[PDB]
Structure formats: C-alpha cells, structure tokens
A paper describes a structure:
[name] is a large protein of 900 amino acids composed of two domains with several key enzymatic activities for viral RNA replication in the host cell and constitutes a prime target for the design of antiviral inhibitors. With 900 amino acid residues, [name] is the largest enzyme and the most conserved protein component of the flavivirus RC. Its N-terminal domain (residues 1–262 in DENV3) belongs to the S-adenosyl-L-methionine (SAM)-dependent methyltransferase (MTase) superfamily. The MTase domain of [name] caps the viral RNA genome, a step required for its stability and translation into viral polyproteins by host cell ribosomes. The C-terminal domain (residues 273–900) of [name] contains the RNA-dependent RNA polymerase (RdRp) that synthesizes the anti-genome and progeny genome.
Residue numbers in the entry:
A (entry chain A), B (entry chain A): 6 to 405, 418 to 454, 469 to 883
Write the structure that this text describes.
Amino acid sequence: GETLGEKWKKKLNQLSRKEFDLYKKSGITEVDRTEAKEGLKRGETTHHAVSRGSAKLQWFVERNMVIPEGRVIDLGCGRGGWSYYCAGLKKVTEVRGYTKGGPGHEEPVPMSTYGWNIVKLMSGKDVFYLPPEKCDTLLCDIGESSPSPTVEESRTIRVLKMVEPWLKNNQFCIKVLNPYMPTVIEHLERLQRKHGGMLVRNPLSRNSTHEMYWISNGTGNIVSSVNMVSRLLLNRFTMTHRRPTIEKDVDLGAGTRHVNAEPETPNMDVIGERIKRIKEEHNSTWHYDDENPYKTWAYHGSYEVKATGSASSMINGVVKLLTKPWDVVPMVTQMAMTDTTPFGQQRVFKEKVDTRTPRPLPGTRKVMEITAEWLWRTLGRNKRPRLCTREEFTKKVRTNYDSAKAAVEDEEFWKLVDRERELHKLGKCGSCVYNMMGSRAIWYMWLGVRYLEFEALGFLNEDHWFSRENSYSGVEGEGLHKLGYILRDISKIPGGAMYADDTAGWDTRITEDDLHNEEKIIQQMDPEHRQLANAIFKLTYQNKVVKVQRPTPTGTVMDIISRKDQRGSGQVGTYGLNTFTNMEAQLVRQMEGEGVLTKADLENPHLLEKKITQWLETKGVERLKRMAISGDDCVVKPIDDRFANALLALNDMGKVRKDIPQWQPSKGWHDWQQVPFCSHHFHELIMKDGRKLVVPCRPQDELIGRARISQGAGWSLRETACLGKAYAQMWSLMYFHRRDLRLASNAICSAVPVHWVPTSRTTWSIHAHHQWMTTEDMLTVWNRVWIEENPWMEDKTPVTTWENVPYLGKREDQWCGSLIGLTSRATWAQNIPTAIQQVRSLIGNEEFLDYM
Amino acid sequence: GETLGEKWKKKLNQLSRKEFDLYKKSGITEVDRTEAKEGLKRGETTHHAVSRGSAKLQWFVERNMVIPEGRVIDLGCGRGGWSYYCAGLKKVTEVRGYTKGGPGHEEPVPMSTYGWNIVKLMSGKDVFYLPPEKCDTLLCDIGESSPSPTVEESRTIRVLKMVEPWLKNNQFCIKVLNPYMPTVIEHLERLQRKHGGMLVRNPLSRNSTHEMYWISNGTGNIVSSVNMVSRLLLNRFTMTHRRPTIEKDVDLGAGTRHVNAEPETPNMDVIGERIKRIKEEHNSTWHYDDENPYKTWAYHGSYEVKATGSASSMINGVVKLLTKPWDVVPMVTQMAMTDTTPFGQQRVFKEKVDTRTPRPLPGTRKVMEITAEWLWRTLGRNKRPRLCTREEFTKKVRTNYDSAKAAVEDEEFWKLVDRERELHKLGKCGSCVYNMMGSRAIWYMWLGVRYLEFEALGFLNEDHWFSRENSYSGVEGEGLHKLGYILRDISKIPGGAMYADDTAGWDTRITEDDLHNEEKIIQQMDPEHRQLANAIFKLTYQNKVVKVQRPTPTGTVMDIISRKDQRGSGQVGTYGLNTFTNMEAQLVRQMEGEGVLTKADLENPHLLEKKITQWLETKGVERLKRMAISGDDCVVKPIDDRFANALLALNDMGKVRKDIPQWQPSKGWHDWQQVPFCSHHFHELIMKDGRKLVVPCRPQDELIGRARISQGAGWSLRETACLGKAYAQMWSLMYFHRRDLRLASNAICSAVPVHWVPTSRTTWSIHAHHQWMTTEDMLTVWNRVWIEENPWMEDKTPVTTWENVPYLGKREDQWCGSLIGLTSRATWAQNIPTAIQQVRSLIGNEEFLDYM
Ligand SMILES: Nc1nc2c(ncn2[C@@H]2O[C@H](COP(=O)(O)OP(=O)(O)OP(=O)(O)O)[C@@H](O)[C@H]2O)c(=O)[nH]1
Ligand SMILES: Nc1nc2c(ncn2[C@@H]2O[C@H](COP(=O)(O)OP(=O)(O)OP(=O)(O)O)[C@@H](O)[C@H]2O)c(=O)[nH]1
Ligand SMILES: Nc1ncnc2c1ncn2[C@@H]1O[C@H](CSCC[C@H](N)C(=O)O)[C@@H](O)[C@H]1O
Ligand SMILES: Nc1ncnc2c1ncn2[C@@H]1O[C@H](CSCC[C@H](N)C(=O)O)[C@@H](O)[C@H]1O
Ligand SMILES: [Mg+2]
Ligand SMILES: [Mg+2]
Ligand SMILES: [Mg+2]
Ligand SMILES: [Mg+2]
Ligand SMILES: [Zn+2]
Ligand SMILES: [Zn+2]
Ligand SMILES: [Zn+2]
Ligand SMILES: [Zn+2]
C-alpha cells in the first residue's frame, strides 16, 4: 500500500530535467524578487524582504493560521525572512531567531526594516542542541529535501521531536518536510491530539516538494489534507503547463518600532454616533473581532460582507491586437497584475497606511504655523471662500459607478443631506464615513458625505485657488500640455538645480499639526460657511471613520476603524489641501537651505517669529515662483544648492522622501527636460517651421500598458473599441512625438468607426483636459491646443500636414522606451493593415477610414 | 618682433597629434583624480574635490599667493572646485560662486564637504552681465582657449576689464588666459600699478596653455615672469619627455562648519614656560606670523629653519631587480610617492588634524565615565601600575635616527631629565614638546620628554596590561602569527556577524572626556608615581605643545602650536590608551545594540548608572571576549546584529567610522577569514600532513611595494642588500603561502651573502616580533613558530621539507594580488637566476647559496 505521496515522489524522480523544471513551477504562486535582490546587492537595508520567506509566512498570517504575538522564537531563521516580518506585527513584542550558520548554511542578514530594534538574530545556533525556551509564538522552517522518502521521513520526525517541547498553549507555524510517509502521519496525529492545530499547503511552495505547515490555529483531518495535496501534485503532472502566478513582494518599511506609541486613542464623543448607525444598519452580522491586525488605527467592530475585488485585470482587445510586439515586454503586462483582492488591500494597508508619524518639534510647529497663516492670507488676497450648492454639485455630476446621476436627481437624497447638515451645525456627525476602495442607504450616505465636503471646501477647486495666477506655485487648470513650459520658465530663474523629491506616501504623512494649519482658511469665511467648514475639518477630517474589507478564514468582513491624523484620501479637497501643505513644506525647506532656519530653531520651544515673518514678507512670493507644486508632487529651484542638504525640517515635518536614506542629500537637475513632474518629463521640440514645442513624455510601456486595460468588468465590444479610440486620440494629441504611439494611434483610429465617439475616460488626472474625446479632426484639434491657444507660441500660423508635427529625436525616442530599434517592431510595422483588418472584422461593417 | 609666446604658440599648432599629446603633459604636475571621479559617479558628496580646480587653487593658497578671507566671491565657479576649497579656510566666512551654466558649460555640483553650509553656488549667472559686489576675496578662473592668439587676446582683455571693478584692497586670484600678447602685457602693467599683485605660473597647468594667474600677494616684473614661462614652455618642446609628476588629490572633509566653535583657547599657565624656552632658544629668528593657517590649534609663534623632507622616496635596488614584473603595476610604485615636504605635512594637518570634535552629550559622558572606571579596575585586578626607570629605559634603547644610544649614555642628559622631573613634581612643565614628523639641546629635551612619559606610563606596555590574558579584548604581545587564530576563536562565539569598522583619524577624535577617563588609572598608583603620572596627563597630554614645519614664500618656518584634546601621536603610551578607549567605546556600542543604552539615555543629563553598572558587572567580561582590539583597530562579534544599526553613541563619542555615511548601518562578516584586522586578513590552510595553519595575508602589491623602499636616505649596498634579505626572511615566515613571495623570497636570499645578517627593520608594527632577523635556517625557524610554540597546533611533529609547507589555494592567491596568471610572471619566473646573477654581480664575491 505505497501511498499517493510515495507515488508522486516516484514519478517526480523519474522525470527529465526540463520536464522537471517545467513541473516544479507549474501553476504555483511566486513572488517577484527582482527589485529586492537588486536592492540587497547594493546593500540597501530598508523595505526589502531578505528572502522569499517573508512572503511565505505572510500567506499564513494573512489567513490567521498563525497569529504571531508576544515573544516570537524563530528556529532556523536563516537570513531572517520570517523574523523581520513578525517584527511589524501588532501583538509581537520580541523576535528571537536561531540558525546554524557556517558553510552550506544561510546567514542572518542585518536589516533596518520596521521593528528591527526588537529582532535578535543569532548565528552559530544549532536548534537540535538547544534547550527549549518560553515563548508565545514558535516558528520553524527547517527541512532538507532528499530524493529518498525514508531519508526525509527521519529528518521530518527529528524536527517534530525537537520542536514539540517548545510548544505550550502558544502560537506556532512548523514546516513538515515530508508529511505523507505513514510514520510521520502517525506522529502528527499524536502531536495534533496534544497541541491541536492542522496541516496546510502553502501555494508558494514548489510542486517539487510535498511540504506542509503545522499551524496552531485550525482543526481538521491530517490524513485528508495530505492526500488532497498528493492528488493536486499528481494532477499537476498530467495537466497542461501553467506559468507561475506572479505576486508582488512584501514591503517591510523602515525604522525603529515603539509599540507603546502605536495605539490610537479615538474621540468617542465625535465618532460614536457614526459607529452606532453603522452598527444598527448591520446589526445582524455585527461583531467585535479581537484578532484584527490594526496597530495604529482604532478598531470599533466588524460586519460580514460578500467577497469583492479580483487579483487581476481585464484587457482591452482592440489595442492589444494592434500592439502585438508588446505582449513580449514585462511592464505593459505587469501593469495588469493589479490586486484589489481583500488580501491586497490588507497588505497595502499594513505596509503603507498602518503607520504613525512622530510629532514634529515645537520649533518646527511654530514655523509651519507662521508660514501657513501667511500662505492662506496670500491665497485669499483676491478671492473669498464661498459655499458651493446643490445646483452646482448636481451640474458637475451631470456633465462629468455613477448612479450618482440618479441620486442627485432623487429629492429624498437631498432630504438626507439636509438632515446630516443640521447635525453638523450642532457639532454632530451621524453618517459621514468613507472607504478604502445596506441597499442605497449606504450609497446615499456616502454621496451625501462628499456633497457636504464639496459644499464647504469645494471652492478650493471650483474657484481655482491653486491656479498659477492665484498661488504662484500651483498648476491647477493649466493642463499637461503647459506643465513643460512652466518648468522651462522655472529653469530660467538663477540659483541651484531643479529638485523634485517624492514623498513616501504623502497622505499618511499628514500630521495633526498639518491639519490644524490647513484649517485656518475658515478664518476668511462667512459665519454660516465657517460653522459648516469647521464641522468638516473637526468632525470628519480630524476624526475619520473608515470602512475596510478584510479576509478571514470564515469569510470576508468589513472593519470599522478610525484615525485622527493622516489625509482622508477618499475625501473632497484632498488635492488642494495637499498642494497647500506641500507649498508650505517646500518654503520651510527653502528657509533651512538659506540658513534662516537652523537646527536650534527647530528644537527651540519658543522660536522667535520676527525672522520668519521677515523672510516671508520680503521673499515669500519670489520663492513661491521658484516652484511647481501639484498635490504631493513638487519641483523646486532654490537660490543655491544648500537646499540639497536641507533635510532637518523636511524629515521632522514627517515628509520623508521616497527611495533614499533619510539623511542622504537630494540630487537635482539643471536640464529641465530630465525633471520628473506629474508622472512625466518634458522635451523641447523644434519644428521644421522653426517654432518650438514643449511636449509631455513618459516611459512608453507605461502608456502602452495603461491602454491595454479596458473599463467595465465585463465590457462589450462597442465600448472597448471606443475606449481604445480615446487612448488613440490622446496619444495623437499629447504623445504624437512618440513614433510607435502615433503609428499605433493611426492604427486604432482606422480600426474603429468614424461615427463612433470615444467613450469613458483614459486616465483620471486633474491635468487631463480630455481634448481627445471629440467630434473633430485630430489635426484641427492639435492646432488649437499647440499653436492657437498656446501662450508660449508667438507666431500663430497653423500646420497643414502631420509631418511638420515633429517626432522626438530618434535616440531620444529609444531612450524613453521606443521599440523602433528591434526588428520585432519593424515586422509589427508591416503587419499593419492585417491587424487593422483583423479588428474591423470583429466589429462588423461600419465607418472605417484609414490613417497613416 | 613676434614675441616668444607667439613663437611657442606657432610651434604648438604645428605639431603632430601624438607629438602634441606628448608635449602637453611633459614634465607638468598632475593630481590623481581616479578615486574622486569614481566616488563622484557613485554620488558621494563628502571628501572629494569636485574637479581638478580644488588642487589648482591649493597651490596658490599654500604659498600665500592669495589668502581667502571674509566674503569670497568666485567668478566662473563651474562645478565649484575653488569655492568648496575656500569653505574650509581659516578666515573665510562666506563663499559665493557665480557661473553661466547651460549647454556647453559646467554646472555647480552639490557637495557636503566641510563648510558646505557657507557655500552659495548659483548657476544661470553670466558674470559679464553682473554688477560688481563688495567682497574680501575675488576669484576668477575664466578663459577659453583658441588656436588664434589674437582671439585669446580679446578674451583675456574682456576678462580683465570685467574683473577690475571687483577689486578694492582685497585678496584676489585671477586667471590670465593669454598673458604674452603685448596689449595684454600693457593692460596688466596698468592693472598692477593700481591694484598691485603679480603674475604666477601654476605647475598644474598643461604645457598646451600659457595661462598665468594674477594674484594679489606679491610684486615683481610682469614682462619678466611671462617670458620666463615662455622660455620654459619652449624648452619643453626639445627636451626629452618626462611623464607628469603625480600628486595626491585634495581631501575636503565633511559636515557643517561653525567658525566660532573652531578657535582654541590655550591654558597659558600650563604651556607658557614651554613657549618661552623655545622662544629663547630661537630668539634670533623668532616671530609671530599672523598669516598662519591654524583654525583649531592655538598659534604662539614661529622661527626660521632649513627645508627638510622630500616629496619622493628612495628605492631598494636588490629587490627591485628580483621583482621586475612589478615595475608594471601602479600600487607598488604608488607607495613610493610619499610626501613629507613641508607642503605635504601642511596638507595633511589641514585635512586630518585641524578639526574639532563636538562635545559628547551628558548621558554619553556618563556611560563613558562608568565604563572607564569599571574597565580600569578590571585591568588592575592582578597587576599594579609601576614606575619605569633610567636603567630600564636605557636597556630598551640599547637593544632596540638613534644617537639616543649615545644620549642615554651621556650623564648630562639624565641631569636635564632630573631637572625637568622636579618641575613636574611642582606642577610645572618646561621643555616637554613633540613634533609632527638648536644643537642637541633640542634633542636631549625631546628624548628626555619621552623618558618621563615612559617613566610614568610605560608600565602599560612593559607590563603587558593589554595582553589578551589581562584585558580579554587585547592582543598585545600576541604576534601577527597568532592574530588569525584569535579571530577564529572569536567566530566560534554565537551571535551576530564579526564587525570591523575603522575610525576616521582616531587620534584626532580623542575628546577631553576620553582624556579624563584614561587619566583615572592614576587612582591605582603609589603617591610619588601618581604625581608624576598626573603631571604627564595634565601638563603634556591635556595641554600639548607642538612643533610643525610650514613653507612660506620667504622660506621654511617652524610653527609652535597647541591643543588641549586629541591624542599626542608622538607620545609614549599612545597604543595602550588608544586600546583602552577603543575597548570602552566598543562596549558602549554593544550596550546600545542590546538596548541597554537608548537615545533618551544619551541626552538625559542625569542618567541612572544602576542599569549600566548591572550590565558591566554581569556581562562586561563576556562582551570583552567577543572583541579583538589593537589600538584604534577593532573586531567585534556582538550577541546579535542590532549592533550594525547602533550608531548613536559611537558617533556622539566622536569615533566616526571611515568611508561610510555617518548614519549608514555597518556591514560585517561571518567568514572570519574575510575580516580585516591590523592591516591583514587571515586564511586557514590544511597542510598535506592534515594539520591546520592560520596565516596572515594582505594585498601582495602592498608587500612588494613596502620592500622596494630602502632605509637610510643615501644607503650603500651592503645595507640595502641586508634590508632586502630581512624582507625575504619575513616573507618566508609570514607569507610563505604566497607563491610569488616565497619564490621572490628564495630569490633575495640566494642573491645575498650567507655571512650577511639582515640589518634594520622591515616595518614598524607592535605585532612584528621580527623572528626573521636571525642567525638560523628558515625552515628551522618556521617549525619553531608554526608548530612547536604554536598553542593552536596540537600535534608537534616537525616538517622536514618546504613543500608540506603549503601555499594558498591558487584562485585565493590570485584574488589577493598574485600575478601567477599573467605570462609576464611566468617569464619573470624563468629569468630567475639571471636576475640572481645580476645582483650578485653588483655585490661582489662573497657567500652565495641557492634557494629554490
Ligand atoms: N527528476 C528529477 N527530480 C529532481 C531533480 N532535482 C530535484 N529533484 C527532486 O525534487 C526534490 C526537491 O527538489 P529541490 O532540489 O529541493 O528543489 P528544486 O525545485 O530543485 O529547487 P532548488 O533546490 O533551489 O534548486 C528532491 O528531493 C528530488 O527528489 C531533478 O533534476 N530531476
Ligand atoms: N598641434 C595641435 N595643437 C592643439 C591641438 N589641440 C589643441 N591645440 C592647441 O592647444 C591649445 C589649448 O589646448 P586645449 O584644447 O584648450 O587643451 P588640451 O590640452 O587639448 O586638453 P582638452 O582641451 O581637455 O582636450 C589650443 O588653443 C590649440 O592652439 C591639437 O590637436 N594639435
Ligand atoms: N540544525 C539547525 N539549527 C538551526 N538552523 C538550521 C539547522 N539546520 C538547518 N538550519 C537552517 O534553517 C534554514 C531553513 S530556510 C529558512 C528560511 C527563513 N524562514 C526565511 O524566511 O528566510 C536554513 O537556512 C538552514 O541553514
Ligand atoms: N561668462 C561667464 N559667466 C560665468 N561663468 C562662465 C562664463 N563663461 C565661462 N564660464 C564658466 O567658467 C568656468 C571656468 S572652469 C572653472 C573651474 C572652477 N574654478 C573649479 O575649480 O572647478 C567654466 O565652467 C565656464 O562654464
Ligand atoms: Mg533545484
Ligand atoms: Mg515628483
Ligand atoms: Mg585637448
Ligand atoms: Mg580595522
Ligand atoms: Zn457628517
Ligand atoms: Zn521622453
Ligand atoms: Zn615637562
Ligand atoms: Zn589573502
């Protein structure tokens, strides 16, 4: 009675080498380690998982199969993948790793990922020589494979006997190398009867091993689950080969972890009513989950929900046909491995949102205070804040998931809005919640929340408070086709290089002090407006209640959480307030670069404001004109390059830069064409006419890949073609200078009917003016944008033909991702009208023209 | 009358391209930019000169041709080479750089070199469009070459007219592109009559340009100096080609400069008498130079002296013959471009010694205080401090520039010693001075100073206070052949990796607090010993008076300077006290890694000692055994790898690591054979006998190059051969495992007489026990060292033949610099006895044997 596992093993060994290489990865889940390995080789110590182990453990922890807590002990820690992951978990307070080390064995790798200060990895530690210790969590990942089952059998038994005395009513996750051998089966059943738990297969395990993990949190039949894996591994022999499901690797953050500074203290007076109403509306499945993972957000309860969100995306057919050589390239397809599974949201939340920014120094808070007041007064020198209305909100909803067009039309919606507004006037909030993305009550509430925000704070956008004219540094309403010109104008200002540092997760870096300073605009409001805005700032912006989905072993739930600081990203006015605070922060950094702000000043509990006020009143506006600031994105050209080393205030404010050590000097550009801004850089093109154009540009694969993703999860063909045409129109207006794009532009537009009007939206950017969704000829639209209404184009004489509309320099094209070098492109370039003919065959018999 | 410069220009253009490439560098001075360019390309912002310009300006400043001070303005600053150099000069308070920038023009490069916080480099600044400003120093390096003299003529005149209004009784250094054209000559004479100054040729200028510099500090004939350059450039056409004199590039340090924190405040009560006696002994040339460059050392006066010190070295003939393929390699010859010119000392002093360490935090001082007291008590648990004597000092001088053998024999020397000692007992110091390396008064004083230091503090070395047995962490008296074994033993201790961070200029990082803590050993001394040691610590160690040479336009002078902290490197007890403080510092870092010491503790003005005392009394010794510490060099194997990120205390103590950003985590090893220690790493070699040897090793070129440098600046041939034989004996005893060395070992020893005994010293290291300077057979000496008296060699049965004395693994040999791969080595390998025959022909007819 040679078991199924032994058959699988016998078949596994009887394989060809390439028949083996095929099978061992067929259909499994696998993390992309490319960035990590490249980062690790350059000696980086932050963010990176030290091995594939971090991701492997994540899978168990995600599903609460093991919940690391208290003192964690990690046997055979190796490089430390499991240990570093545990360091950032809510209830973990200490991690001890033991591993053998020496020749032929992995060695602990020092890192500075989040919680490193509670991780103690020791090499030279053979666990089979170690006396058991007290711990709340026991991890073990030891097990060396062997082509002989009985060899693995003895190795597995050895592990189990070593590891058993470590177990005592505590969490555990233990690797069982060979679980199908009958003697091992017998030992596990004895183990399960004493310590509980169950065997689980990890999808990240290759098919070349039958390994499973004995986890503490679960029950079930050991013999059953083992054969279930055996069967699966057997079927994966005969079945057709499936390349691995590629998964994004883990981000473990950076810096020391102070556990006692993590927990959130909610203002229950403010957010209480909101929780109660949610609780009442979902009373039948409402519960309080003590196993929630939230370290930094206050948890108030959960209710059950249906599982939403796929871990993939759905591809636009028409444009995938006409861009055939890009099925070859990774990035265009890598953009389609989006993950909005409830697991994916939870991973993003932990790694990006579940953090706390240390309170800025008293001197730093003073500078921000002074600068903010000065900035708001400057921004309101001409304009006044005003209330927006139902009428106004309705029009914008009409013109621009939208049954919102029906909601704003339903009178009962506005009745609810009125009801909630009267609460705000009394200092109460009843239903203002947002999501990390019931009937229509849930929908009306949410849309009513956004209206009240729009009503009180919408003027910032609607009245263009951050236009360049009104804000000096702003670019609101300008458009992607003008941004390049603005950067060119900035480069003409004498001083240092042009700097463009990205903040790591800007919205999560907004402090309580930032919120306090953004709030000061209410001082310029009329009384009734003021109390409404004051309600929005205090009740919903400084006390946020959030809905977030979370997978559980028993099903998906919706968690109700709260947080005082950070930016509510799903809230109206995010862009303006981000622009405001960023403007302030970049002024503060400029003061530091110029020596007006010193380290002593940041620490000084009673900083003198005469110096700051003086600097702002004499140089404030001039310094604002040195900047281009769009939300969290910024370009700064300081008066000299001391700015590069000005890091004290920037870091203390909490606006830590992305992808660079906290205290490493910044690096800028003097060639304004190499400067990144709003996901673009900008090139200067001299036309044959002699006149100059400044055009937006970005990596081509980013443009190709975004277009091979259609809207509507279940789209037809009349829409998918119309979406593809919209991208084509965009490409011919904004990226006409890219050879592949303009050619692929003339491919889509001739493979889609002329009576068809481009539907849906290309991308959602505030800089997108969408001039490419129109009635009209693409050359006539082009002339209007780039010549006629372009203020940086002196001579206005139109362009009659498409080839005095220039391309990029050819080498410049290739450098930005053009494929015109490869022969695969030139071949794609002759299969042109065949590919056209192929899609127009799918669509049917309508209006086709031909585009060269 | 076409001038000499115009002839030179006419000849320069009429040259072949390779006849030009030859001439343009023939005989000029040139800085090695290789490290800088490689560093700059990796984005490093410290230490590196941004261009060759820093070195070029240095040449002028060195010779006081221009003395940058106050507000410095730098026209055509370019990358900023001149500006960054000025930032670290004594009297400079602000540096403003203006440069054009844009296409075809150099751009300012942001750096973090010392004084960056007073450097304001602005691009987009055309100086021919700029109104003149007030400044104390005007620098200008503008001038574009042209094959046409008259073109250069107009460009030069343009510069002169632009630059003249900037001049007003201030320092200046202005590039004069073409100085030989008659009209330019005429303009310069007019300029010189108004603003003074003179023209100077810079040796770093290529011969392809006639450029000179109008500097403010000097007078002389413009027409004369121009033709002097013309003549020189003309002669360099016909003369035989000389490859450039290669010079070491500039080191501009790192960090912010706080000018007001730089000046030294001398204790004139303590050091006054010493200055007075020096002043009296050199009263005829004694003066007070206000133009001294010392920012951080107190200056007290100068006297004139003869110029000492060459900028090159003198090569050992015998071993250069027998290592012919290494004339090809750079590093062996690069080791001979030593520079002990008075310029070189001044460059080293400015860049390395003329710095100030910020006072450590109060909490940090407490930890050091507690740890030091605990450490001294541990070190004195068995031994007592004792006085050393005249007899003892004499013997060591007899057995070991030494007319010191005559001085200790002269009774009048000891009379002076007694006289100075009686002052010390009264709390006075009269003649205790040392040097940065008159009659014999100067010599007796100095040697008498070192005796009194030896008398009071010599016990630390003479009684082996830092032997491994007595200090746990120490390696004094162990020997280079045992160090490797000690590291192997340390690797057996479980925990983190083995760390080996080098301190940048350890002796200059010794704080007043370090000195205070090292002083505590006097508490264990007898009264008479105590007052003598107390005199040494307080009068000469904590108040140092130093003699240093400095070049001036009029001649070399000797400056008398002083400093309270830092280690007197030319003083007795340096090694022991460095070992002590390093032991302490590495314990303090281990406390931080283990969490015993926190950031709050460092800042806490009244830190609690119960925690530290507890840690030391229970774990202190165990942690000491995790370390190998020899002076400023250390190897630490912490209990885990949190140590790598433990940087707070280390930096705050002032012991900043070398060649790594101040806050970047350290990187260690687990392979103990890759760990650097005492200029070596150590390999484990299994003999054919089966027994294992652990041997010292280092880059081979470092060993080759050190041996191709003889002692005695004017050596004969009987000594140079004897020095070469000493190296050969060393190589066969310590580096027998290196194939080239053991072969070159058997080459030197057979090319040098057997009746000749190896003279002089190989290298000066305390770990060198010099077993290679002996009467005896090299195999019998080898057996004694590696087998018989080796405690890590259990079986003691001797080795009869030289080829069970193993080599390194062959790939391991090549990796450490072996040349056995190249065919140039294999050819060197057959010209063996010819090369032997060649030297034995120089020596004469004596005892030659032959060595295989
Ligand atoms: N038929 C066949 N079986 C193999 C081969 N290599 C390994 N195996 C079997 O697969 C089992 C586990 O494979 P591992 O070698 O541990 O893992 P892997 O998939 O080869 O990946 P790596 O070990 O990282 O190279 C072994 O116990 C072998 O029985 C092979 O080349 N051919
Ligand atoms: N005969 C000859 N003269 C040259 C050549 N190149 C430059 N010169 C002369 O040398 C003068 C200065 O040389 P530069 O070109 O400024 O400097 P360089 O030595 O060539 O070094 P780089 O400019 O960095 O390439 C010019 O004004 C020319 O008159 C050449 O190739 N042949
Ligand atoms: N007897 C033993 N004692 C301690 N560690 C051992 C051991 N035998 C093997 N090991 C180590 O156990 C490790 C298993 S791989 C562990 C990977 C780790 N969980 C991570 O996420 O990175 C190997 O590196 C191996 O060196
Ligand atoms: N009209 C002008 N105004 C300002 N700078 C100019 C200029 N014309 C040329 N320059 C700049 O002057 C520089 C001379 S090379 C200067 C090197 C600099 N002293 C250093 O040590 O690094 C060039 O980089 C050139 O770009
Ligand atoms: Mg394999
Ligand atoms: Mg950006
Ligand atoms: Mg040249
Ligand atoms: Mg070292
Ligand atoms: Zn509300
Ligand atoms: Zn581009
Ligand atoms: Zn003295
Ligand atoms: Zn070596």
